Amino acid sequence: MPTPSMEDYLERIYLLIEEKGYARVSDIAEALEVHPSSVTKMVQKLDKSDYLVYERYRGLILTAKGKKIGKRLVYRHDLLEDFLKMIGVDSDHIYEDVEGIEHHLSWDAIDRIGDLVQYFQEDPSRLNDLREVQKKNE
Amino acid sequence: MPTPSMEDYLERIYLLIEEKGYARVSDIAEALEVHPSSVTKMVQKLDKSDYLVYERYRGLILTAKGKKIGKRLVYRHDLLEDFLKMIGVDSDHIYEDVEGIEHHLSWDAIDRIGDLVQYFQEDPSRLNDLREVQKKN
C-alpha cells in the first residue's frame, strides 16, 4: 500500500539515523533540494499510515513497520547493485539502473535475483565463466 | 532521443510489420489499448520526424531509422522476458515485470543481461545448479 516515494522517504530516514542518529525535515529538504513543506506533507502521509512519528526535539522516528520497510529497501538496493556489478554493467550506468528498476520489480523477481546473486558466490568460478562469455563476445 | 511513448509505439509497429508487412492503426490502438485518435496523433509525430510513413490502404511502414529502433526494442523486451523466465519468476508476474523495467535500464545493462542469458544457454547444467540454490533457499 505505500507508494514508491513513501518507501524512498523511509529508507532515507533510516539512513539519516544511520549517519548521525537523527532525521530532520530540514535534512531531507536539503538533500532533495525541495521545499520543506513538501517534506512535511510527505511526513504527514507517513505518520497517518503509522510508518513514523515526529517529536520536536528528536525529529523523525520510525515505527516498527516503518523501520522494517526502510531496512528492506537498503537491502534491495544492495542486492540489485551486487547483481548489476556481477553481470558487468559499467560504473557509468549502474547507479541509475539500480534506481530505475528497484521500484518496478516484484518481490518475487527481487528474490529470484537474490538466488542468482547467491548462485554466483556459492561456487565463485561461475563468475569467471560468465566473464569469459563477455570476453568471447568482444 | 525517442521518448518512452514513441518507443512503445515503435516496438508494437515493428512487431506487426515483421508479421504482416504493414501495421494498421486499428491494430495499434487495440494492442496499446488507446483510442484511435491518440494513435493518429502519435503517427503524425512519427511521420513528421521520419520514423515511418503511412501507405494508403496498407498502414504504416518504418523508415530505416524507425526499423532499426523498433527491432532493438523488440530484442530488449524479448531478452528481459527470457531473463525473467530463466531465473524462475512465476509466469503470472512476468508480463508486469518486463513492462515495469524495460524503460528503466541502460543498453549497457541490456547487453550484459544478454551475456547472462547466453552464459546459461551454453551449458544447461548451469540452470539446474541455479535451481538447486533456489529450492534450498
* Pairwise CB contact (< 8 Å): A130 & B115: yes
Q: With contact defined as beta carbons under 8 Å apart, do B106 and A91 qualify?
A: no
- Tell me the β-bridge partners of A23: A59
For residues B118 and B133, state if they share a domain: yes
Task: Name the 3-class secondary structure at A106.
Answer: coil
Set of chain B residues whose Cβ sits within 8 Å of the Cβ of A104:
97, 100-101, 104
* Pairwise CB contact (< 8 Å): A88 & B115: yes
Cell of B29: 490502438
List helix spans (H) across A49-93.
64-87
Nearest to B109 by CA among A84, A99, A138: A84
User: The CATH number of the domain where A134 resides is what?
Assistant: 1.10.60.10
> Domain containing B103: what range?
74-137
Q: With contact defined as beta carbons under 8 Å apart, do B98 and B77 qualify?
A: yes
Which uninterrupted H or E stretch holds A57? none
User: Which among B93, B113, B126 has CB closest to A108?
Assistant: B93
Q: In Å, what is the CA distance from A11 to each residue of A20, A33, A118, B6, B50?
A: 15, 17, 24, 33, 45
Q: In Å, what is the CA distance from A130 to each residue of B11, B75, B115?
A: 30, 21, 8
For residues B5 and B60, state if they share a domain: yes
Dihedral (CA of A38, A40, A41, A42) sign: positive
Which of A41, A57, A73 marks a domain boundary? Answer: A73
Nearest to A113 by CA among B14, B60, B86, B46: B86
**Dihedral, B112, B72, B76, A3 alpha carbons, nearest 10:** 110
Mutate to test the interface with B, among A99, A106, A111, A136 (most CBs of B within 10 A): A106
Contacts of B137 (CB under 8 A, 6+ apart): none
